[PDB]
Design a protein around this ligand. Structure first.
Ligand SMILES: O=C(O)c1cccnc1
Ligand SMILES: [Zn+2]
Length: 173
């Protein structure tokens, strides 16, 4: 009963929230561990709840008041330019929805980043360097995909052109 009560609260809180809720926050609200929250959300996903774990916390997927522009972008940068690439995108008001790496063993690996602010980017880059941080390894020579989302196609164009000026796009060859 208590586990089902806890998961009912998680759904309520995620539906009411306009921002990601960290596993740590959800764990503190329910007196469990972040690991228990992982298991709760896993069970909810198997019940077809569209809950996504992002780099900033859990979100319940729903639609916006205006339909946003979206684009798949092929990128490439050196092993020290991740923070500058991501900051360039959020500074143009672009949501960095995900990143995909073409891994020789796993195939395409996609992480739901949902980076939106400078603080999102700074905290994510710090946490990845403090861990193993090998999602964008020497395996693809920095080549990777992003799904980007913005209010207009004009805004995506300016952000993508800002990537090219820094040499962060995959050069058609
Ligand atoms: O965009 C990048 O460079 C990136 C994003 C997530 C993880 N590693 C690299
Ligand atoms: Zn990138």
């Amino acid at each position: 009963i208590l586990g089902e009560e806890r998961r009912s609260l998680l759904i309520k809180w995620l539906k009411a929230s306009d921002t990601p809720l960290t596993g740590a926050e959800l764990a503190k609200r329910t007196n469990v561990s972040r690991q228990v929250i992982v298991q709760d959300v896993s069970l909810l996903k198997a019940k077809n709840h569209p809950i996504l774990a992002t780099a900033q916390g859990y979100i319940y997927m729903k639609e916006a008041n205006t339909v946003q522009a979206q684009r798949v972008v092929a990128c490439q940068h050196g092993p020290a330019d991740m923070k500058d690439e991501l900051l360039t995108l959020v500074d143009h008001g672009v949501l960095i929805k995900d990143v995909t790496v073409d891994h020789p063993v796993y195939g395409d690996i996609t992480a739901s980043l949902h980076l939106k602010s400078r603080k999102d980017v700074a905290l994510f880059c710090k946490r990845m360097e403090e861990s193993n941080g090998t999602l964008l390894s020497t395996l693809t020579k920095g080549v990777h995909m992003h799904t980007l989302e913005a209010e207009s196609e004009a805004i995506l164009d300016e952000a993508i052109r800002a990537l090219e000026e820094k040499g962060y796009l995959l050069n058609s060859f």
